[PDB]
Amino acid sequence: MTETYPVVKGAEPFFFEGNDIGILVLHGFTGSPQSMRPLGEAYHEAGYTVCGPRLKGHGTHYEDMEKTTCQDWIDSVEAGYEWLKNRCGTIFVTGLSMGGTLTLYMAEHHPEICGIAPINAAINMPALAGALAGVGDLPRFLDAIGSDIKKPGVKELAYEKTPVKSIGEITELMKKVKGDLEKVNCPALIFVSKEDHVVPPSNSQEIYSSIKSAAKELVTLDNSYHVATLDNDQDIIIERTLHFLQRVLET
Known part of the structure; x- marks a missing residue:
């Protein structure tokens, strides 16, 4: 598909140029980089190169999202990963919800990744996936x-x-x-x-x-x-991720 709508103000991806260590920061289903940008800013302030990509069909209009596939979303993630690899020798991945699912995906497919920090990652969503289990046509939107x-x-x-x-x-x-x-x-x-x-x-x-x-x-x-990256414990996520990153780098 190709997106018909422009990116909504505040939903822009972030490409923060920093040092030789890269953090890939992934948002979730129906979401946008806005939920992840406070984390990205904090990680960049610590010196890291940071990429917070916009999943295809996200941050524009839900009619765009309706046309996208899970391979489109994987492709958005992989493109952010390739941007980091062009300028970084060491890469970490973190993400919220389906971004956490995609964080796990990346670790499953890229043994070079040095560590991951999934946040409320999803492998089973009975309320969402289960919507497809009923008899008779569902509405177009939930x-x-x-x-x-x-x-x-x-x-x-x-x-x-x-x-x-x-x-x-x-x-x-x-x-x-x-x-x-x-x-x-x-x-x-x-x-x-x-x-x-x-x-x-x-x-x-x-x-x-x-x-x-x-x-x-x-x-x-x-x-x-659920959206802990914007919630009361945002500070804990940031601090503990930074300590984790440093510990992996040092050790």
């Missing part, structure tokens, strides 16, 4: 999934409708990544919200148990819902 945030007054820049056509795409992605979790190698810092109304927190426990990383941690966020 309700928005965005802005599951505990801190009052915070709005995620995400679409106001969920295209049912896109649900099969995220389902295919989750099946593939779940099936390949044993290929995840590398140091892993897995963040999960205690209460998450979008991605069941047990996802992250299963991810933790299924990957083969010799260095892995599960950190539970006690004051955030």
Whole structure:
């Protein structure tokens, strides 16, 4: 497909030029780089090169998203990874929700990646994927999934409708990544919200148990819902990721 609508103000990807170490920062389904930009800014301020790509069909219009495929989203991620590889020798990946799914995807396919930090990553979404299990035609769109945030007054820049056509795409992605979790190698810092109304927190426990990383941690966020990167525990995500990155680099 090709996008028909321009990028909404605030949904632009970020390409921050820094040192020889690159962080790939991935947003989720119906979302945009706006949910990830505070993290990207913090990581760039620590000196890193940072790429926060915009998934195809995201940050424009949900009619654009309706036309995209899970391979389109993989392609957006891989292109951000290639931009980093052009200027960095060491690369880490982090991402929220389906961006966390894509974080795991990258570790499953790229043994060169030095560590990952998935945040509320999704391998099973019974409310979303399960929408396809009923008899009889579903409507074209479901309700928005965005802005599951505990801190009052915070709005995620995400679409106001969920295209049912896109649900099969995220389902295919989750099946593939779940099936390949044993290929995840590398140091892993897995963040999960205690209460998450979008991605069941047990996802992250299963991810933790299924990957083969010799260095892995599960950190539970006690004051955030799903979009933790914009929520009360944003500071914990940033600080602990920076410590993790430094520890992998030093050790």
